[PDB]
Amino acid sequence: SGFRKMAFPSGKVEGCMVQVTCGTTTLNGLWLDDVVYCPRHVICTSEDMLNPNYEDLLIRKSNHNFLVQAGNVQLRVIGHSMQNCVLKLKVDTANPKTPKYKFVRIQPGQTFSVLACYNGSPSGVYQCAMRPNFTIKGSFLNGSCGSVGFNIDYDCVSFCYMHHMELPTGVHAGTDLEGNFYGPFVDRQTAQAAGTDTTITVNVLAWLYAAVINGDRWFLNRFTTTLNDFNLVAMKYNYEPLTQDHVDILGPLSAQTGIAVLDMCASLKELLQNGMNGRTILGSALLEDEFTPFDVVRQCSGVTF
Amino acid sequence: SGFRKMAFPSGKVEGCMVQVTCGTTTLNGLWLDDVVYCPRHVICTSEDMLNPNYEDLLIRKSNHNFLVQAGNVQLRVIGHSMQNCVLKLKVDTANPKTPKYKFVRIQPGQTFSVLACYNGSPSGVYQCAMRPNFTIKGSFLNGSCGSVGFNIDYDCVSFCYMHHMELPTGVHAGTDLEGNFYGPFVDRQTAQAAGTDTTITVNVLAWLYAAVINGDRWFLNRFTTTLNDFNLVAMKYNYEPLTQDHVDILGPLSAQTGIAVLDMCASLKELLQNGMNGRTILGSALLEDEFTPFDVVRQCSGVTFQ
Numbered sequence A: 001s002g003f004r005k006m007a008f009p010s011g012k013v014e015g016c017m018v019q020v021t022c023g024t025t026t027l028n029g030l031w032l033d034d035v036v037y038c039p040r041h042v043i044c045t046s047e048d049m050l051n052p053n054y055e056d057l058l059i060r061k062s063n064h065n066f067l068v069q070a071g072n073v074q075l076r077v078i079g080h081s082m083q084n085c086v087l088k089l090k091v092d093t094a095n096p097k098t099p100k101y102k103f104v105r106i107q108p109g110q111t112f113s114v115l116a117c118y119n120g121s122p123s124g125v126y127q128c129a130m131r132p133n134f135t136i137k138g139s140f141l142n143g144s145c146g147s148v149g150f151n152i153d154y155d156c157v158s159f160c161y162m163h164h165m166e167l168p169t170g171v172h173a174g175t176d177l178e179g180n181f182y183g184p185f186v187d188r189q190t191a192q193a194a195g196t197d198t199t200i201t202v203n204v205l206a207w208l209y210a211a212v213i214n215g216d217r218w219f220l221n222r223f224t225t226t227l228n229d230f231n232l233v234a235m236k237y238n239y240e241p242l243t244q245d246h247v248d249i250l251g252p253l254s255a256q257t258g259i260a261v262l263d264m265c266a267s268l269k270e271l272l273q274n275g276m277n278g279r280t281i282l283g284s285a286l287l288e289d290e291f292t293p294f295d296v297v298r299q300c301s302g303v304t305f
Numbered sequence B: 001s002g003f004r005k006m007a008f009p010s011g012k013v014e015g016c017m018v019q020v021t022c023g024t025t026t027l028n029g030l031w032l033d034d035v036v037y038c039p040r041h042v043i044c045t046s047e048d049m050l051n052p053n054y055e056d057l058l059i060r061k062s063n064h065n066f067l068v069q070a071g072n073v074q075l076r077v078i079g080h081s082m083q084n085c086v087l088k089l090k091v092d093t094a095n096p097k098t099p100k101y102k103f104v105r106i107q108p109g110q111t112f113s114v115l116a117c118y119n120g121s122p123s124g125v126y127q128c129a130m131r132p133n134f135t136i137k138g139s140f141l142n143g144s145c146g147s148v149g150f151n152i153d154y155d156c157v158s159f160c161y162m163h164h165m166e167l168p169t170g171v172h173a174g175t176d177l178e179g180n181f182y183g184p185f186v187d188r189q190t191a192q193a194a195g196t197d198t199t200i201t202v203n204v205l206a207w208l209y210a211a212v213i214n215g216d217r218w219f220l221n222r223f224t225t226t227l228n229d230f231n232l233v234a235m236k237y238n239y240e241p242l243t244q245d246h247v248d249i250l251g252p253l254s255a256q257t258g259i260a261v262l263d264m265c266a267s268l269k270e271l272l273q274n275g276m277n278g279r280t281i282l283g284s285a286l287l288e289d290e291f292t293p294f295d296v297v298r299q300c301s302g303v304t305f306q
Ligand SMILES: CN(C)c1ccc(N(Cc2cccc(Cl)c2)C(=O)Cc2cncc3ccccc23)nc1
Pocket: A025, A041, A042, A044, A045, A046, A140, A141, A142, A143, A144, A145, A164, A165, A166, A167, A186, A187, A188, A189, A190, B001
């Protein structure tokens, strides 16, 4: 019993974290095989960030300008290239701790673990979701750039996020490991803002199923609804639309608890319209949307890596 | 910016997790140097659990009755001894991945990361706190016994908890790494129950300072309180008494934000009286008590967003 915001074990990723220094800028790099991946803004000074021409800034650098440190060992950079907003530093040594891995681009609503790092040293691990507005509500200070997000499936680490920046509202923005930003953000010190966010409906429903599996059932009711009526209500409270794909994905949880997805949608409609009336669900007075249906099944079944 | 329930990176502990089997029972063990630590109830059957005589059960075992698996490698048990509620299995191989470590017994209110494991394989990592009633609100299924709690301040792993059981309310009980239980619990399936739990006041105050550091002050007020009047109010909402030690510990956070400890206590008194009125604090509609003053200093910026 119990239900916690659980991250994947971070060991396979910790063995890939390195410190990348270029001039006065120090940040984190991800060392996989013979390449170190890091944000391309490592080559910028504070003035450069105002309007950087990364190709022009990069052509002025030699391999020896990039200092890469793995633990207390200096790696030697033997090549460099840029792919979108990520800099790839070819090193002479393949990382002996390289796990089985893939680079995956995730969709909003999907969750992942973040291994927050400073100076190439892991500091903490936490779970978060890619918001519908493509930001992440992370916990990052200056120097955390290059920290990564990942998921694990079997023995394979799927890297999905690399940290680049903090927006004015305190939320965060970054790229996939191919350097493509999530959201309409750019790596330049210019006016940028997170758009209005919405709640991840399928994830709230998954968490309601998790509450039922854990004995919290006060919100259940005799009612059901239709997908169309539910979507009208959900749109009113800034909730993401629920699709037939989402209902299909919630099938296993619906079968285990005996509560149909539209039966749970009727519970969610009532909670949106009336609140919790002083009650809590899994220790929360807010409807939690950072657990996916897969996260709920995984935590409630004890899947290991 | 941001404030998350953050766990320590688990890699140093993952490299120590092993599977321990004794007969039909399989659980997790912690392999440090040439010793594997695990709950002594690994030698029990389901029937043995009501009134087990561990000394009598253990004397009937030989080293080769304990099967220890580290990855796909069988370790050889060359000795065994019981220390309180932990079994220590001496093995013929020192763990090459043994980090710098210490065993520490923690006090209620202290937080730690839990690396939940099944069959010697890590499943997830989350942050926990030792409740004032000595239980932990973990996430553990059957087979999670032997999973450990730890902190990793400055590259040294301080092991503070080993999981033993789940109480009827769905909360968890365990021991320190010397096998001493936290709380009035025993490793017997006799009628046991968690005592009435209370809120960790010093931690709620730490989290209110975290909210001020991150730029939010909506909950503050122009009032102060004496320590005694605060405690008289706090106890009415099932909050733990705040001691002078707690006031001293909050000193650094008070100095960084410019808000006196007893002034933050007056804000807490008002929050308890009024609720949040549709507002949130650091993304929460409840007063959070699983962040210590030390956790807030570690995670938050050293510069307040004034
Ligand atoms: C030195 N230099 C290379 C540098 C300096 C500052 C930054 N910026 C500004 C910025 C603004 C538009 C776009 C981008 Cl990509 C970057 C960041 O946002 C980094 C950052 C990341 N996470 C948490 C943070 C908390 C406080 C301050 C900064 C944080 N990036 C590079």
